[PDB]
Amino acid sequence: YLNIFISHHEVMKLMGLEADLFYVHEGAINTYAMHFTVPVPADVHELEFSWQSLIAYPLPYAISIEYNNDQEALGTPTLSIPHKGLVPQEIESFLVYLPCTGNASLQMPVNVNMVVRAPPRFNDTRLHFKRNKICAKGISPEPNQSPAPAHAP
Ligand SMILES: *[C@@H]1O[C@H](CO)[C@@H](O)[C@H](O)[C@H]1NC(C)=O
Numbered sequence: 001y002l003n004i005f006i007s008h009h010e011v012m013k014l015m016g017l018e019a020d021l022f023y024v025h026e027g028a029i030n031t032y033a034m035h036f037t038v039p040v041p042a043d044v045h046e047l048e049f050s051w052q053s054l055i056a057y058p059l060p061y062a063i064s065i066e067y068n069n070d071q072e073a074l075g076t077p078t079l080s081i082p083h084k085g086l087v088p089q090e091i092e093s094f095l096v097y098l099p100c101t102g103n104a105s106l107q108m109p110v111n112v113n114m115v116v117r118a119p120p121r122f123n124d125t126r127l128h129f130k131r132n133k134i135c136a137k138g139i140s141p142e143p144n145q146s147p148a149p150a151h152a153p
Pocket residue numbers: 141142143144145146
């Protein structure tokens with residue numbers, strides 16, 4: 001009833017291979033793949049997840065993040081979607097932003113927790129995505145709002 005996967009482009013960005021990876025396929029969790037800790041290079045500033053509900057019954061989701069607050073190398077992770085809502089019935093993708101400050105070099109765990117509530121005939125999908133974020137000094141995401149020369153009137 002539920003697909004959760006990372007696309008070909010996401011696997012190429014993260015790992016350099018041409019493949020996709022379904023972490024959940026029609027409700028079945030890829031427990032083997034969930035064991036792995038995926039490294040996130042210094043120059044990768046976001047993780048992209050893709051998902052799709054395969055039924056009409058509403059699928060509530062909840063997303064939480066695990067990371068050490070108390071350091072100077074990684075800024076606060078954010079989402080491109082609300083941390084709670086419904087899983088879409090068309091394939092959609094969302095981002096977990098992992099913005100390294102560029103003011104420090106460091107490796108650290110960042111884990112993404114997801115819970116998708118199931119209709120009563122199935123069991124909830126509980127996921128613990130393990131990632132190890134690399135940060136490097138002088139490597140940080142660029143802003144997309146561009147500067148403009150300014151002077152006083
Ligand atoms: C953000 O978009 C701007 C376009 O103004 C571009 O200069 C920059 O390279 C982009 N950076 C990222 C991380 O998307």
